Design a protein around this ligand. Structure first.
Ligand SMILES: *[C@@H]1O[C@H](CO[C@@H]2O[C@@H](C)[C@@H](O)[C@@H](O)[C@@H]2O)[C@@H](O[C@@H]2O[C@H](CO)[C@@H](O[C@@H]3O[C@H](CO[C@H]4O[C@H](CO)[C@@H](O)[C@H](O)[C@@H]4O)[C@@H](O)[C@H](O)[C@@H]3O)[C@H](O)[C@H]2NC(C)=O)[C@H](O)[C@H]1NC(C)=O
Lengths: 36, 48
């Protein structure tokens, strides 16, 4: 699955359950688990 | 306070820029082709 955190800015202590190899920011928040 | 009490507001799928792009395309189509009786293959015509 992929996880979207609406209120986290991952651009470049993060309140995320787990990181991954495809963490990146979008206009809808921080997305983990999806390739851009 | 709203967020601390578990109430969230979600963003719309289409941004303001996309809606503005749609309206600009519609206005340009009316000014250039002005399709009548539907929206199919645009047929150009002078505005007058
Ligand atoms: C999520 O966070 C990012 C990154 O924020 C940076 O890191 C945090 C910890 C703080 O230190 C911030 O101040 C840092 O910026 C935000 O992106 C930044 O947004 C701001 C505000 O729009 C941008 O500031 C503008 O940048 C332009 C001039 O900067 C020039 O140089 C920088 C490199 O130093 C370069 O990145 C930039 O493209 C320019 O070439 C200009 O538009 C304007 O004057 C203003 O200074 C800043 O550049 C952005 N940084 C990055 C790395 O993208 C996000 O906005 C934020 N997201 C949300 C949703 O809030």
């Amino acid at each position: 699955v992929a996880v979207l955190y609406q209120d986290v800015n991952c651009t470049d202590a993060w309140r995320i359950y787990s990181t991954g190899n495809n963490v990146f920011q979008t206009q809808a928040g921080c997305l983990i688990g999806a390739e851009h | 306070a709203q967020k601390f009490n578990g109430l969230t507001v979600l963003p719309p799928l289409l941004t303001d820029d996309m809606i503005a792009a749609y309206t600009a395309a519609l206005v340009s189509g009316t000014a250039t082709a002005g399709w009548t009786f539907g929206a199919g293959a645009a047929l150009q015509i002078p505005f007058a």
